[PDB]
């Protein structure tokens, strides 16, 4: 069958992907620019990620359409056309890893997050990562290429000029670069690092949430021991334990919460002094006042701390879905390259499967705006306003 028929389907799908990638991620950038509630360090890497996806539609997809034709070109010009998408993929990887690290810092050390993770430092990290992406992705242009050994018979059959080659990806980009350097070192290792970071984030969240519940139970259990205690020493043992737990849990709403813990510790000290004097009944009656503080203050702190953690678990899952989708989207093309490289006795993957793998990789530049709309309310609402207005 004529090559332009099969090409037409591939080309049309590529253009449709390019349009969607541009529109969706331009909307992401426009939402962050307009909504100050979306202007945080986490969303600065989201914008950098969206910028890479906009460049996929504007440049990488037209480059992929061009290189599918095998047109005659100077080999190093062809290399740029072949490698630029690797720059964008590398940048995306850096942004995805930065988002994962950012969410770990926020959940593991929230008391020092604002002082450690700032917008100015984030912009500096984004700039460095872009420079690194260019270096990694354009490494073939540094000499790790096949331009020294051009397919002369293919170039002559296509009427290429002297010094030109038929511009095809696998003719100019070495497969040992694609598999060992790009896939294994620069894609697989960072993705396994993100998985590691995500596991730590979820484990930290779970651990925190049994700590909140453990403290709620413990306060309640120690109130029961005091009620059915029969001597002053037992009341003292329970109160002593309580006081330590109250200070451990203390480490508009913040003013009433600090006042709630000032009442709690003070009421524990009142009953402790009565227990040390041997006045058991008085100590017990004083410890009963703690239930008033628990209902009006402590329980509200427990449902708000728990609520905050849930929101973090939710936000970490949304970010992990984005990283997972990147892996799902790019792995097929990388796995095919592994078969091409590691099995010279296997027939090369057919052209239609190469096209399918390539389009799948490009579809990843479309999916992120939909994940933000379906999982993050502040993005969703902002998208509605932009579209309406
Ligand atoms: C700012 C943005 C829009 C600029 C985009 C510039 C792009 C399209 C330019 C920059 C470098 C250019 C390449 C430089 C070298 C060659 C070799 C030549 O034998 C065929 C064209 C080809 C492959 C060019 C294609 C167009 C090209 C890729
Ligand atoms: C931000 C501005 C400066 C754009 C920078 C891009 C320019 C400087 C780069 C990008 C790609 C480069 C080209 C890539 C490959 C080739 C083919 C080679 O046979 C001659 C040089 C030539 C044609 C390069 C010239 C310089 C070039 C056009
Ligand atoms: C990451 C998830 C989606 C798994 C993706 C699995 C895909 C990429 C795997 C599964 C089966 C694989 C194919 C199995 C057998 C062959 C025949 C060989 O002569 C060329 C490669 C080729 C055609 C493989 C290409 C890659 C392949 C299609
Ligand atoms: C954590 C996971 C996603 C790591 C990625 C797994 C990759 C690296 C694995 C999965 C399946 C593997 C392929 C399975 C079968 C063959 C055929 C053999 O003749 C050469 C190696 C080759 C081509 C393997 C190369 C590596 C491979 C592509
Ligand atoms: C060439 C690439 C263009 C796309 C990059 C576009 C990036 C511009 C988006 C600006 C943005 O979203 O930033 C919000 C604001 O800067 C927070 O203070
Ligand atoms: C051929 C084209 C080559 C272009 C390649 C790189 C260009 C632009 C991407 C960078 C845009 C990423 C924007 C990130 C958001 C940001 O910078 O916001 C930080 C905020 O200002 C903190 O105060
Ligand atoms: C911001 C908007 C961005 C603008 C994006 C524009 C969209 C055009 C898409 C692809 C270009 C590919 C052009 C095709 C190049 C091949 C020409 C050629 O020579 O191929 C014939 C070959 O010789 C036979 O073997
Ligand atoms: C507007 C986008 C039009 C993009 C035009 C792309 C040119 C298609 C082309 O040149 O055909 C493919 C090649 O000839 C077969 O291998
Ligand atoms: C904002 C900037 C937007 C402007 C971008 C221009 C649009 C498309 C470029 C596609 C290149 C067209 C390829 C034509 C090459 C050609 O004529 O073919 C050579 C022939 O095969 C040998 O004799
Ligand atoms: C604002 C962003 C705007 C960016 C638009 C870029 C679109 C397509 C790239 C086309 C790649 C180069 C096309 C090659 C055609 C060509 O050079 O053919 C002549 C022949 O191959 C020499 O012998
Ligand atoms: C985790 C990545 C590890 C995957 C490593 C797969 C290597 C495949 C391989 O080495 O197969 C070559 C075989 O010797 C050809 O004769
Ligand atoms: C594939 C090539 C990889 C490149 C390896 C060497 C590059 C090392 C770069 C490190 C970035 C460190 C950040 C330092 C910022 C200082 C900027 C300044 O001078 O003010
Ligand atoms: C959701 C499941 C995927 C749906 C569509 C995927 C279709 C492509 C799947 C390909 C698996 C194997 C492809 C076989 C290629 C022929 C092997 C050869 O001749 O070398
Ligand atoms: C849908 C996007 C429209 C693109 C139409 C151009 C046809 C592709 C081709 O020329 O092979
Ligand atoms: C991909 C789908 C997202 C596109 C939905 C239309 C909104 C785009 C408008 C805009 O550019 O801001
Ligand atoms: C193709 C290039 C795609 C990039 C588009 C990104 C759009 C997002 C932010 C750009 C900043 C907005 C500039 C004018 C703002 C006017 C205003 O604030 O009302
Ligand atoms: C900027 C918008 C793009 C403008 C025009 C699109 C037309 C591109 C023509 C491709 C030429 C293909 C060829 O001659 O083989
Ligand atoms: C490696 C390439 C280095 C590029 C320097 C770009 C700007 C870096 C300075 C900002 C550092 C920061 O604030 O974290
Ligand atoms: C390698 C040679 C140079 C490659 C690209 C140079 C720098 C690229 C992008 C600038 C950084 C992106 C903007 C950061 C937001 C502030
Ligand atoms: C920075 C990383 C890559 C930039 C390389 C520029 C390529 C110039 C090639 C010139 C030539 O080979 O004729
Ligand atoms: C800082 C690093 C920037 C590297 C600068 C220039 C590299 C581009 C020129 C390479 C041309 C030769 C490539 C080759 O050997 O095939
Ligand atoms: C992280 C994933 C990379 C880990 C190991 C790379 C495997 C070593 C390469 C295979 C042996 C070389 C060969 O094919 O003979
Ligand atoms: C091939 C490596 C796959 C890892 C993908 C990286 C994103 C992590 C996603 C989910 C981990 C959370 C449980
Ligand atoms: C290889 C990765 C495969 C699938 C990733 C899809 C979504 C994973 C995110 C987990 C959410 C917790
Ligand atoms: C989800 C992934 C994107 C969905 C679009 C899948 C459909 C077509 C992708 C291109 C396949 C090329 C068609 C036949 C090419 C050929 O026969 O050579
Ligand atoms: C040929 C497919 C063209 C575009 C592919 C996009 C498919 C998935 C994208 C967004 C999720 C839909 C909601
Ligand atoms: C390839 C992408 C497949 C599935 C996820 C895309 C649509 C997201 C909606 C939530
Ligand atoms: C990343 N990538 C491509 O972008 C590509 C390709 N073949 C054609 N293109 C465009 N291969 C094998 C590839 O690994
Ligand atoms: Na991306």
Instruction: State if residue 215 touches ligand 8 by the CB under 6 angstroms criterion.
Output: no
- Rounded to 5 degrees, what are φ and ψ at 333? -65, -40
Distance in angstroms (rounded) separating the CA atoms of residues 375 and 35: 17
Residue entry with tokens 């989207």 = 329
Nearest to 154 by CA among 142, 170, 141: 170
Name the DSSP letter for residue 151.
Answer: -
Element (H, E) at 165: strand 164-166
Give distance in angstroms: CA of 83 to centre of ligand 24: 27
Q: What whole-number distance in Å separates Cα of residue 17 and Cα of residue 267?
A: 65
Which residues is 73 bridged to in the sheet? 165
Q: How far apart are CA 141 and CA 138, in angstroms?
A: 5
334: left (phi over 0), alpha (psi -120 to 50) or beta: alpha
Determine the Cα–Cα distance for residues 320 and 199; give it in Å rounded to an integer. 10
Give the three-state DSSP class for 207.
helix
Q: Return the SS3 of 164.
A: strand
Alpha-carbon distances, residue 269 vs 107, 238, 283, 301 (angstroms)? 33, 12, 10, 21
What is the spatial distance between Cα 24 and Cα 283, in angstroms, rounded to a whole number?
65
Q: Residue holding tokens 């061009």?
A: 66
Q: How far is the CA of 30 from the centre of ligand 16 (A)?
A: 6
Whole-angstrom distance, CA of residue 166 vs CA of residue 159: 9
DSSP state of 279: -
Residue from 61, 66, 68, 73 to probe ligand 1 pocket by mutation (most atoms less than 8 Å from CB) = 73
328 lines ligand 24 (CB under 6 A): yes
CB 69 near ligand 8, within 6 Å = yes
Alpha helix segments (H runs only) across 251-303: 253-276, 280-288, 290-293, 299-301
Distance 53 CA to ligand 2 centre (A): 22
How far apart CA 120 and CA 275 sit, in angstroms, is 55
Q: Kindly provide the b/e burial profile for residues 154-190, where b requires at least 16 CB atoms within 10 angstroms of the residue's own CB.
A: ebeeeebeeebbbbbbebbbebebbbebbbeebbeeb
Residue 329 Cβ inside 6 Å of ligand 28? The answer reads no
197 lines ligand 23 (CB under 6 A): no
**CB distance 359 to ligand 25 below 6 Å:** yes
Atom of ligand 5 nearest to the CA of 31: 12
Is the CB–ligand 15 distance for residue 30 below 6 Å?
Answer: yes
- Helices 211-227 and 232-250, interaxial angle, to 10°? 160
Index of the ligand 10 atom closest to the CA of residue 81: 11
Q: With a 6 A CB cut-off, is 121 part of the ligand 18 pocket?
A: yes
How many CB atoms neighbour CB 112 within 10 A? 10
- Residue 365, CA distances (Å) to 14, 63, 180, 186, 206 in order: 12, 15, 24, 19, 32
Could you say which DSSP state residue 145 is in?
S
Q: Counting Cβ atoms within 10 Å, is residue 121 exposed (0-12), middle (13-18) or buried (19+)?
A: exposed
> 275 Cβ partners below 8 Å, 6+ apart?
232, 233, 235, 236, 239, 283
According to the CATH classification, is domain 209-304 in 1.20.120.10? yes
Query: Which protein residue's CA is at the shortest distance from atom 6 of ligand 14?
Result: 12
- Whether 6 is in the pocket of ligand 24, judged by its Cβ within 6 Å, is no
Distance CA 300, CA 124 (A): 40
Resolution in A: 2.1
Ligand 14 pocket: which of 2, 3, 4, 8 to mutate (most atoms within 8 A of CB): 8
SS3 147: coil
């Amino acid at each position: 069958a004529p090559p332009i028929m099969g090409s037409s389907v591939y080309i049309t799908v590529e253009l449709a992907i390019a349009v969607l990638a541009i529109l969706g991620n331009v909307l992401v950038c426009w939402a962050v620019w307009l909504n100050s509630n979306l202007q945080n360090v986490t969303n600065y890497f989201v914008v950098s990620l969206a910028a890479a996806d906009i460049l996929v539609g504007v440049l990488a997809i037209p480059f992929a359409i061009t290189i599918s034709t095998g047109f005659c070109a100077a080999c190093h010009g062809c290399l740029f056309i072949a490698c630029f998408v690797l720059v964008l993929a590398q940048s995306s990887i850096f942004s995805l890893l930065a988002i994962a690290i950012d969410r770990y810092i926020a959940i593991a050390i929230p008391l020092r997050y604002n002082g450690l993770v700032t917008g100015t430092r984030a912009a500096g990290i984004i700039a460095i990562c872009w420079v690194l992406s260019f270096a990694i992705g354009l490494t073939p242009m540094l000499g790790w290429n096949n331009c020294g050994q051009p397919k002369e018979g293919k170039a002559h059959s296509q009427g290429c000029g002297e010094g030109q080659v038929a511009c095809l990806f696998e003719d100019v980009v070495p497969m040992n670069y694609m598999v060992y350097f790009n896939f294994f070192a620069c894609v697989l290792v960072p993705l396994l690092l993100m998985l590691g970071v995500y596991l730590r984030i979820f484990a930290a969240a779970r651990r925190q949430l049994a700590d909140l519940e453990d403290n709620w139970e413990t306060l309640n259990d120690n109130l029961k021991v005091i009620e059915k205690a029969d001597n002053a020493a037992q009341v003292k043992d329970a109160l002593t334990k309580m006081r330590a737990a109250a200070l451990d849990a203390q480490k508009p709403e913040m003013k009433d919460f600090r006042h709630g813990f000032d009442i709690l510790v003070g009421q524990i000290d009142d009953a402790l002094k009565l227990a040390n004097e041997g006045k058991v009944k008085e100590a017990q009656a004083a410890a009963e006042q703690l239930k008033t503080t628990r209902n009006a203050y402590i329980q509200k702190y427990l449902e708000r701390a728990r609520s905050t953690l849930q929101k973090e678990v939710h936000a970490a899952k949304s970010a992990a879905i984005i990283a997972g989708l990147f892996a799902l989207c790019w792995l097929p093309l990388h796995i095919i390259n592994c078969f091409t490289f590691f099995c010279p006795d296997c027939s090369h993957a057919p052209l239609w499967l190469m096209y399918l793998a390539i389009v799948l990789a490009h579809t990843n530049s479309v999916v992120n705006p939909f994940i933000y709309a379906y999982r993050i309310r502040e993005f969703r609402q902002t998208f509605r306003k932009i579209i309406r207005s």
